[PDB]
């Protein structure tokens, strides 16, 4: 066990799906997993292990922001034998053609956090995913007839940024989605020698006003979950 | 009424105590508050409002890391009329005679996060508590006959630093406690015009490797809560 | 002696008042201290030692800027047994309610200097005062019937900044007064194990353009001196 | 024509392979392209256009270093209708399991250059390749019976670094290969709205200075060119 | 032989003139050097050695940008006994009163590269020329009737820079010319114990001014080469 | 008049010699100047005006450190029509071959200060002296049978370095001497359009046991003053 996960080596599958919201981890375990068992509840950061089409799969919230998710992913990797991490989150969009409910696959993650410069002697560490995992998610998405873009995300430290112009810079450089985790998870993966992938669904268009019914947000969340789970199976071959 | 807090104006007291552990926030509500009612449960980040010795007080989790607490503290200040935030957290000690369960008060907070540099044109912003809140906490702790050292905290982005030597630097500069939120909450306090104070209980020693349990962090750090709660009463004068 | 102070251990009190202007030190010694003797004149940086109401007390100029005061504060601490340093200075205001000749107490000090980053492996060190010293100053002013605000100062390297926009940021984040030394003295204090506090008298307003003369700065900011000297007696318990 | 390219629109294919060495571009043109024609010789930086399995393809040197390749790739993109750039180079390995003659595909490229911080408001831009081009080069390599590793390159400004310790940092976060261009190219691609990819063969292992005979270097160089070309054809469909 | 120069000790004079363009190096050899012979052609980077008025001189292109010339200049100093490097190039002007075909001598070289910060522990290294070489060039030019401007160059990493506003900053601080190598060469000079100088002719004006008019000098490219060669002769005396 | 100088336009010559120590300025005026008159004493920063060999010359202290001297040089340039500033001080030698007697002329000045980065958009400004003043000083020195050394100074913010990591680095890149002002004055000069020079005598030399009797140090200090004063007369031609 660790100070943030009341569990032991074995309670987790070698692949963990991670939404920000612990309750979405509960929903995911209750809906797409068989024989789900709750394996962590320290700080209410719910985690579950079960099976998807006969493959052992875990799912556990990471909380919001680079520091939070850095703790959980690091601990999972070094203390619970985890090999792959798939974050299933939401993101804000800055591109004109990226619409709500669109799926995005962070091949890379830009960030305004210092965590990677701390790791990397103040140089530019390109926080990227594991390629096979990105390929798996792309191929799974196709098999499900879901459209996804593969590119850069931007993991932000401040949800409420005093730096509004930055969004114009993100758009200029083709950032597909703005969330709060990817660059930190990718930094942990590189530091501790595991593989990670971030998939998001666009839940709001920054500098725009339009919404979606609760029914649509769910199906879209389900689609993300399905892309994620199915890509694991492709990953296993 | 806000993106991470499903509550309405009035649901929160004008003062909110905030551990990072939403479950500590539950314990505190159940143990120190009367007539407490749950006022938030979004993302399992439990918030409660009740009374202490007659005074309306709220307690709510803020999650781990600067990005996580920046969100909740921003939203309480700008949208729930919150005037005071008292962070009540845990911390790692670096000094040889700061021991387990010592209470320390963050008058200022160092950080390796970039959020204040971002706010402050890449210069050094001294992240500090409201003085009067510090004085209320000092006088409250004296009346209870609980020791409390006042000084600098260090708000870390990485619980697991790659840079072991930073700890030696923190020690050299008299850092009383290593945690993950203080400098962040102080940034939001200054930015949106509120008052903040961080009080922490030492939950592990980075050198002797003494540490507490998750169960102990969640429910046995009560000196700091008495201090925070009595300090609010001194504030009302 | 030390390279910038021609005196011996014992010549200074354990508490040393330090304005930037040595001529102000002279005025303070001749006006507030009994039986004052000059104890330094290296580089014209006059330092004196007298008694204040029976308490042995020193006052000495520290020059303009962080590099200047960092030299004197270091030398006093390591070679003259000085335990407390109270900088008594002048500062420019940016806040609309802050008037000329207002006394401000620097609990914290922001800076655009690189010295603390040099100290703190390029992270954010919160340059803070000693708490008790702050509290003493607060209580001493209350006893004297002198108003004083406690909070953040900004320690500037460039008195004539090309970045006029930085004042707008200082104001937004509640900076009480702009000077050139506080963050550097707090840095030295932390590095060498002593305690410091900066009290300033507002000598010009950056927005209203209202100003005082050199001669007024040199001798007429006496509120802060009474507060400083009386706070020392309080600190003696 | 452009300042550094004396040719006209039409003279380049929409895809340009780019080795650092202009002489190797001539070699690629003579070895792989039918009816190759020289289309640039400004600054001796040879560019050629021909056909490969009936497909118009170009090859041009980009010189050494980020600022150099940035110049050429930019002009190609804005004035020659070039949609894809494939850098083909050699790289140094820092990982022990990464052997001489391995093909390394840079899905992302780290760097100690400031060019991208300049572009991205001093934040971390994750310099990445176009995903499809990565996947094409992977599929092409497989059909050729070759296993290419996909991950991060490090793009160095200094071939002769004063700081040998940086290599251990690169090793610790999984850098596959060390070159001097990729991150700059990825930077240009995102700024001006085109697609890039860098493929390298490992020529030396930086730690033990262990290297390879010209015969095996010519061989693996050709395999790299074969992969790059076959990648374009997969991309076309 | 070095990894970028196929020659042997002796093949190069102890003074090397360097243009960006290898073809320019070719032009210089045939125009000014008697008994000119080619000593390198690796990567088409033409180098030559002949005599100018019986003085053994070499001329060799350095390629474009700080990383490219840093390679060549390092290898020349460390393995070929080169003592002096004289960069001869073109530069753009940002000041109104600097006119076309003015000759600018870089006694200093500002930069937006990170190479010197990497060398200098992230501080400000002032990348400067050798003082004797500067005066030799001033004196050489005066003898020819040209008033060379002595001051700062700016070594840009991006010929196509995203930040136009920086040019206003360059104008404000008196930068004489904008090229791409000088700071890097001055960096190498200092690191490896050699002497360097960059001389440039003003070949255009950067950006449109309602105050830029000045005039035009008759100063040819050939004139700049004369100044450089003659300045070597002065240095020998 | 300004807040740091109680004088009026006309009270200063258009050239000002500036030691750090104001008593030294008094010494300089009394020794080399005819009809020396005190023109400033605000903050005891003694400034004097008189003539040397019929030529109007002023001399005034600038205090210790970049921030102090920046205030005075700016004010002299923008308010007293000063055109040339010659710093006359001392420095420590890091290079073995730079003896404890030598005159060093700072053609450029490195620094660990942030003041130029604040001026130059966080890039590298090469803080340089005006060339002609450099040449005037070399000639004044030569005529007095003194061989000045021309090169880089290092301008330190921290006389008492926390770790002293930079001394070996200064030695590696050829820094002639260490003081605390040069880079700052040069930046003011660049910023406000005047001309500066720093001259220093080597007052301490690391790693040896070199001895000087005061007959040798007074001769050498006077030597520096003559060099500076004679350099002005040369510049007047
Ligand atoms: N040694 C340590 N280092 C960093 N953070 C913490 C904490 C607090 O607990 C959380 C991470 O464990 C986070 O909220 C932080 O503030 N306790 N002990 C700590
Ligand atoms: N508007 C202003 N900005 C910066 N510093 C000061 C001061 C202080 O006074 C001195 C310069 O006037 C120096 O010590 C500085 O800290 N007064 N007014 C100021």
Residue numbers in the entry:
A (entry chain D), B (entry chain A), C (entry chain F), D (entry chain B), E (entry chain E), F (entry chain C): 1 to 237
The authors write:
Purine nucleoside phosphorylase (PNP, purine nucleoside orthophosphate ribosyl transferase, EC 2.4.2.1) has a crucial role in the purine salvage pathway. It catalyses the reversible phosphorolytic cleavage of the glycosidic bond of purine (2′-deoxy) nucleosides, generating the corresponding free base and (2′-deoxy) ribose 1-phosphate. E. coli PNP is an excellent molecular machine conducting efficient catalysis of purine nucleosides glycosidic bond cleavage. It is a homohexamer, built as a trimer of dimers, with all its subunits having the active site in the open conformation in the apo enzyme form. Monomers in each dimer mutually donate two amino acids (His4 and Arg43) to complete their active sites.
